[PDB]
Amino acid sequence: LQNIIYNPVIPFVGTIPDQLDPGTLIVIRGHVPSDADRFQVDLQNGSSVKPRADVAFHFNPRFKRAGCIVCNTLINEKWGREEITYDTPFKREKSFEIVIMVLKDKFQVAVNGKHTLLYGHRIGPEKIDTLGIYGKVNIHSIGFSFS
Ligand SMILES: CC(=O)N[C@@H]1[C@@H](O[C@@H]2O[C@H](CO)[C@H](O)[C@H](O)[C@H]2O)[C@H](O)[C@@H](CO)O[C@H]1O
Ligand SMILES: [Cl-]
Numbered sequence: 001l002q003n004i005i006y007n008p009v010i011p012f013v014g015t016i017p018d019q020l021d022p023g024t025l026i027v028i029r030g031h032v033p034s035d036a037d038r039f040q041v042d043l044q045n046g047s048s049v050k051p052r053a054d055v056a057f058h059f060n061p062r063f064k065r066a067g068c069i070v071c072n073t074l075i076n077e078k079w080g081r082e083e084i085t086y087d088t089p090f091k092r093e094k095s096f097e098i099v100i101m102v103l104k105d106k107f108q109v110a111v112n113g114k115h116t117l118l119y120g121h122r123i124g125p126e127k128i129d130t131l132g133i134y135g136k137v138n139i140h141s142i143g144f145s146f147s
Contacts (some may be wrong), residue, residue: 001143
């Protein structure tokens with residue numbers, strides 16, 4: 001992997017060091033604490049706090065009861081329609097590997113070496129330049145694979 005970031009402070013907000021062309025991989029390895037309610041991985045257009053940067057891809061594992069993964073897009077500080085994946089592999093007190101692959105018309109996400117979900121592009125992925133990681137999660141490493 002390229003441009004690796006080890007043991008970042010959460011919340012992490014960092015520039016993705018190259019364009020998100022088809023085939024680009026974002027590999028995030030980490031662990032969910034015992035008391036975690038949720039965390040999120042956001043692919044953003046910039047890092048503006050106010051107004052809040054558009055989030056092309058909001059990937060949001062939630063842990064109450066059986067848990068889920070909520071996926072959405074934030075444009076001009078307005079959330080779109082949620083896409084909820086109920087078959088979640090994430091668990092409190094367990095380590096994980098997230099691999100986000102950028103395809104032409106969608107993201108594909110695999111967790112722990114297994115397909116988890118697809119998310120169709122609502123913003124052009126060329127506009128994404130920032131990776132945000134927020135909430136109750138411990139991130140061990142962030143890596144990128146570009147062409
Ligand atoms: C603002 C608010 O409370 N919205 C509720 C949703 O929670 C938000 O969901 C988005 C993604 O769609 C973000 O994760 C944000 O951080 C959350 O506050 C909630 O998911 C739905 C019910 O499922 O209700 C909204 O009112
Ligand atoms: Cl619970």
